[model samples]
Target: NLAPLPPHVPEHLVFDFDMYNPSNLSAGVQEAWAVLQESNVPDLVWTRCNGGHWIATRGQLIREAYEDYRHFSSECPFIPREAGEAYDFIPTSMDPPEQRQFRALANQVVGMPVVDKLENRIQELACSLIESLRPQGQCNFTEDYAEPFPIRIFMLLAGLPEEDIPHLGYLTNQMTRPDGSMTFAEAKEALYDYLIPIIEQRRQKPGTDAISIVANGQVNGRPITSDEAKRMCGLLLVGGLDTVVNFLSFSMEFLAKSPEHRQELIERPERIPAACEELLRRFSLVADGRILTSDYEFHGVQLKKGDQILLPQMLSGLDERENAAPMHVDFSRQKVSHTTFGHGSHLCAGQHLARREIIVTLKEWLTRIPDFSIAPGAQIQHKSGIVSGVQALPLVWDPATTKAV
Candidate 1:
């Protein structure tokens, strides 16, 4: 067990907010972090919860730390130490020079060009799914649309069977946020076990799928090893399963509650791309940071060697210093900037594909179910950890207002 956090300048500035509370709603989760922002705390502070780690409050500090990987190592990237210890996802956990090689390979497979190639499929899938639910007028957005959409697209991208989604999805969730049923170590091993055989299979016979491409492709002039391939695949699986699934729910819930925002998208459909960027900045979900390689003082706070830092990808844009009235979502705001996907050498390789999906959904959903709102009295919940997200989003719409195609 780790020792209790030593005395620090700022007292109780750091608190380990519970992530799995039954009553935890999405808005409540945002507000909880907003509390920290409202406090105008320093850029860095120590928290004695979740194995004790540091939290970076400003965008500049967070971005700088990420870029200076020599000081803030990505080798052990998770909080709680154990999760970081078990985290071995390729490129994400590897520092640059080496990280760049694998990242390029991964990018070649899922980058913007790939997304453009897959655009028709993405649009067709979104329309097909939305059309199926439009007649119902009310639906559980989480299970009905949010979860399946991204997972299925990822499965298709990986050339994995759709039938495998349920099992893979469950395991992915376990690795990120264990429900106390499995230890972090155990979950990591389980995911590795599943990846081993898949990696071998892909290596034996390369295919056009993303997984096969990574498994068989060369990184730095040599074919990637099974271990490396497994880690890369693992990152893709987790990224595909959790990140966008939660994002879609959060964005929809925001739209449901903010009619004016919804109308903005309706009035300016071409602005959906910019709207996605703003929403990504506002709802920056992913809570991941690097470990300090050596003792150093940042913004008047002493960070020890091997100390873990929780630089939530979402917190930066919300900071008043980085964004004016950061809490308010303004799609037309010029110079909207954030590191929601990630930063430096560890930036998300699959961001283009994720953006494509978001833009497509926005355009199609507004055209199909333009005036939807959260079902009366229903609550929206948000989960935290490496990836933060909504538990459920119940939506209701007037079918009469939606056009029949």
Candidate 2:
């Protein structure tokens, strides 16, 4: 259902694309989005599919939009206007000086140093999860490993019970990829409700958990309020539970289809890190955007004040102009570029943790179940939304070939 285009947007500039459900989704999510980059399509186009908004189709424009935070504000960063207005995830929802103050606190939680400290835990979890599945001979990659590996580790870090994953995961999914069950505001409120009391308790009884650290920590040289703590903690939950969960499925699915690609890593284990970067580039996902603060002319396109523009981090690396043969994965590629984690002041706070999870999964999984492929007679389905994902990945391998670790 397309909305009526505003007077400022020219007809030639209009591209009726749905970010939530791309038309070419069956081919793959990223491929579906690449349709916007066809030679005839302009770099910046207005899409009426999601309540009428602009989409930056090129890496150049996407990077520029993110960098110029003053013109493209994060105050309302999602699309369809209402969700963006409802989004209030700490530094992700703030810009500049205020954004920076909270980002420092977030880094203290999931930054590189934190990843180093959690290195053994991450490796052990990946190995334990993979080895458990190794003997199964077949598994639903999405459910069996992807969801639990990163999420359980995150649960441990947050001091939350494993029992809450289903309820919390459901709420987080609604915000990025709605199934008509709840509104963005409702989903956010539900998350806040879960966090509010926990945050209050953590503030009084400080522990080593991520929630306690943030709840008792300072922002802008002052102790953080309960409200601020919930908002920040909510962001951490979404980042932990959603971002890497879907990513693992995509990377595994790719490895399943491309046997030679899997064999390369099996034969040359040292290339795993480089391969991880290339995979991150080739399978990059996560597309959220910023709202226009005022009417502005960007790359010769007229963008009105209050307009929502989707600066997809996923598209940056997939753009052919940004990488030669963008679709193909080359571990040896000298330069791999993308805004998968995002760019500018709103770059993802949990990227270090995400990288560790991916690298560890790739290394550990290959070491155990080195050879696997998509189950026969099953079609892989990809979901498109603020964060793209795989519906299910039924991976099958021969038990005879597998070795227990």
Candidate 3:
């Protein structure tokens, strides 16, 4: 049901675009989102979809909204109001000084130092997974490689059993892209239920795992409370399980379609890092928003105190004004502009790991299976919500062409 427009909102400013199931999702998730940046669309418009929230469709507005956290608070960071209200995952849910200490604790686990320590494992896993699949002419990239690579690495890091992925993965998906099997609150409760016991165990006997570190760590010079630990741990699980897993699929899916693009990387492997930045900008996928703290006039739009505005990290680089020929994927671009890792104080903490995983995937996969394309007769589909993703990517190549490393 479309929300009844508040008296404060003008009808001309309304653009009912559903983030969950975008009307043009079949075209491509990124393409569908680009519809918002159409010349006719307002830079910041009111959308009746997702229960009448505002959307900042341009990079200029998106960055401004994110930087101005006082007027636009992260207190409720999801859409449809209900989910955002229920979202309380430590630093992501808090603002400024309160959110700062928790972010430092989060960094202790997933930060660059951690990535540097796990560097060899990350490289080995990428090679192992790619080599195992090289013998096969075909592979379901989503399940075969994308899902296992980052997820397994994360599982090992967190010291959680690999067997628990199915249960935890399902609950994580429900929170971001619900199938109506559960509500955001229900999924959150189940995650906490699962984490509570583990948290209790870790507190009593701390291990060197990410969970144990957070469970026993301090915040603001004080011992972190059990409840605070649980909230931060839950945030870690969401970041570990969801963000990069789907991104790998999206990046690989594009590579499958663009043979010429692949050749550029194959010829000059040094371009892998640049390619990763370009891909991150092009396939930028996370979208969450802030709730209005008070009645304010933003870009001439009268936003009420409680209105929610979705500031998509995905759309920033895609805006034509932000990048010339925004839709084109040019790895050699002088400067790849994007908020893919996000903007301002709430930037994604897992970005370093995500970039490492991406760079490794590109370098290793291209080295092994230098040539591949989407499976014939398969229609690639995308899903959009708080996070957007490729549904299934069946890629095929001649095994003879693939080199075993």
Candidate 4:
């Protein structure tokens, strides 16, 4: 439903585009979003949808806005002001000096060093999950491989129970993309409700898990508060359960359709890492935004204070100015550029872990299950929102075609 035009908003700047159900959505999620970059659309336009907000349609402007946080604040990073107002995920909600302190703490948990420690587990898990699915020759790729692989790893790292996933996963999913059932705040509160008891336990009895790190950790030489710990841990739940979870489905769904793309990785095994980069660019998911700090002129357009501007991290890679022939997914494509992880000070801390998960999945899955495709006549449906995702991925293949790698 559209809201009335803001008194200050000019009629000419309005372009009604629904983030959840885009008009061009029939083409696919990525193509659905590309309508924003259509030749006639302005670099930045105000949309009456979702209670009205400005959208940065190009990579250059999006990057500039993310890099310049003074004008574009992270205080309210989501659409629908109510949800952003309820969002307080530590470094994600904090700005500059303060954000950096907590970010250092966040990096300690998800950065390369943590990934190094978990490397063996990551590989073992990928192989275990793929090998299990390999014998069956048919599986819902989203559930069988995508969810278990990343979710279990994060669960182990966080010292959370596998049984807690279904409930926790639902809460985290709502924060990024709400179903009509509940609002973002309700979901976030439920997440906090689930984490509070656990966080308190870890505070009293610390362990090696990521939750313990944040639970009993220090920031800026000061102890992290219980409220702060819950907030930060909530973000991790979403980050862990969401990022790679949906991404694996997108990459696999594409691979199941395009066998030639899979062969590129299979034939030149060493190119798995490069292929991961290209895939990240082509199938990039995750969109977040910033709140306007004050009334300001940007790109010859006026942005009022308290107004939110959606700087889609996904759009960065898709921008033609950033990559020629932007729609094509070329594994050998030189200079794969993207803000898939994000940009500037708030760049995704879990990016190292994300890349490791993606690369491992590609290498391990391809090694075990060499040939697969979508179940005959099955259509892949993608959901769109802040963190867009695949609804289902039914894949099938011959067990004889697979090997014990």
Candidate 5:
């Protein structure tokens, strides 16, 4: 926790918002963050929580800040200051010109062409997993389907063993949603520990796997170092393991509870892509920041040098200015907009795969189990942090109404 507002901050601009444990989290993590957009809330304010950082409450400011990377440097893109210092992932931590070189290589793996290649596996896994659960009539959606589907697909892409998930999952979770058991550097080092040896081995004998490609690949016409390969690969693993894994649970949880929404995807099937966008808007769940390059006045507020401002990717979509009735899930929404995958030079390189996995799950899951709901008397819970997540999704449905196709 941080002390009272600094003398430089105005009394009116101090909102003291807590992103980790928001005031209205009981309503839902999305709803809790919506508190920032309430009629009286300002567009940008300073929060004392998580070590006294500034918070951007609207997409307008968030977008501008992200676009003007000169002022808001990516050098420190995490809250609590120390975490950002320890956040040394390649490309993500670097900025322009330099960042692009690494990102281009990353794009080679997760971009559309890669997704096009993995399409068969993605569709097969979705169908196989959903069909297996169709007969059970009840399932813990998180473990039974959500976890295995994307994680397994990622493992297959990265050439990691399925058996390694338990260990890898724990490290990945610590990076995204810390349980206060370890500091960010501690967690990141543990991940580096697991990757360092494997990266060295892959460098000796390159293969078709992602690790091998990075290990043996060159960048900008120069042979890259093993350390650089691991750094970029580590960030790629975070994208592969974290982004869509949490999102699948949120989308499925909404589906289990909303028969009307589920039927939308079931009837048209054409709407699956549109439905995917809307759901991404309503359930967008990622928050990160940039460190101030120098003391500057942003939107009439004074920001000191080295200050960190959290530009939550989650908050941008929920901003009323960006999407009217922003909280509502409107599939047919005109010009659906949000920065869920980030914006500008640092936009998410892995979004193509994320969208493909999401679209595949929505189409295949609804084809099999169209009429399911949250288990009777079960209250779904959501957790908050850099990544938003569901605690569990206990879903129950009648096998009689389900299609075996």
Candidate 6:
């Protein structure tokens, strides 16, 4: 006699989404976890791929699991066991007490106060970037505006030079999506190589920038090490380059395709913040998970100790059970809960800065080019992994319809 698999999953509901493979992705990445939604599948199922782990498909279960970090530890928060093992970024990788110390330091730089101070700058950059492109009528939205705008802001915040962006951007891309041009190890090494000199120079003579502050600051009353500073800086660099760069593409593509939604914002300019929240909820871009600390049974299923669980932050709210017709993007929808910026203790430190950037982009872009659409006969592509987004967004608009303020 044997216990039957739980009801939410079909016998064939395998949780094997080769996220690193470019060919298997779809416009929305729903194909990756379609199996989890099968009638016969369990709410929680064991996946053989990525070294055999558990996955929580619904928002309720995923939220509970994330909130209870004791069972689901952030010590190793990734799918493949190797990835979890190798992840050692400060704050994000550390748990609770130790994590809190570094998080406070990070918050000092990227928190709400910093965002408020840079609010005008954020708005200026967004409007300036969009204005430069509006006259063109058609442009590759991703490369033309999305990538440079946020990357430049991040560099300015970190006291880095704009000229160094091309080299740094390429290295950051390799870290996220290795294309055989460099292994993950090689990419990480290169990043550290760049950071080492910066840390050294800053340590010798500290300055007011975020990097210098972290380089000179003490953690638990101990001077932060060069290696530690490098890791933290690397995290900030990746956060700045990867998340918002692709997010702009996705948001712009959505706006271009949905004129009704875009028009709603154009009329009610103040609604940009809520609109940004809804977009983040609908297109929860990041796909990350955590590991199990000890053997535990939940909802009548047995899980082994040290088992890696792949709880993609993107899937839950998209499940119909969590929201009414979850795929539909309604700006008016209330109580739109999501883990787009992560959840629980490991919530994103730079979330405020990211939000400011997004809100500013929406406000400024609409103000400049209010009537825009996806270019006719143009192809739209999507890329996945830790950070998922549109590869390119060819957009068209009429400059005559736009008016200068």
User: Clashes in each model (backbone N, CA, C under 3 Å)?
Assistant: 0, 0, 0, 0, 0, 6
TM-score of each: 0.95, 0.99, 0.99, 0.98, 0.98, 0.92
Residue 392 local lDDT, model 3: 90
Clashes (candidate 4):
0
Question: All candidates' lDDT scores?
Answer: 0.82, 0.91, 0.92, 0.90, 0.88, 0.78
What global local distance difference test value does model 4 have? Answer: 0.90
On residues 206-239, what C-alpha lDDT tens digit does candidate 4 reach at each position?
9989999998888777899999998899899999
Model 2 C-alpha lDDT per residue in residues 1-405, reported as the tens digit of each score: 999989999999999999999999999999999998889889999999989999999999999999999899999999879999989889799989778888888999888998899899999989998888898899999999999999999998899999999999999999989998889999999999999999999888899989999999887668999999999999999889998999999999999988888888889989888898888888888999999899999988888999999999999999999999999988889989888889888888888899899989987898888888899999999999999999999999998888777
Q: If both were scored by TM-score, which would come out higher, candidate 1 or candidate 6?
A: 1
Best by lDDT: 3
* RMSD in Å for all candidates: 2.1, 0.8, 0.8, 1.0, 1.0, 3.7
- Stretches > 4 Å off in candidate 1: 1-3, 7-27
Q: How does candidate 3 score on lDDT?
A: 0.92
Model 5, residue 83: C-alpha shift (Å) = 0.4
- Best-to-worst lDDT order: 3, 2, 4, 5, 1, 6
Task: Write down the worst ten-residue block by lDDT for model 2.
Answer: 213-222
Candidate 6 Cα lDDT to native:
0.78
lDDT of 5 at 122: 95
Model 1 TM-score? 0.95
Report the error of model 6 at residue 313, Å.
Answer: 1.3
TM-score of 3: 0.99
Candidate 1, RMSD to the unseen true structure: 2.1
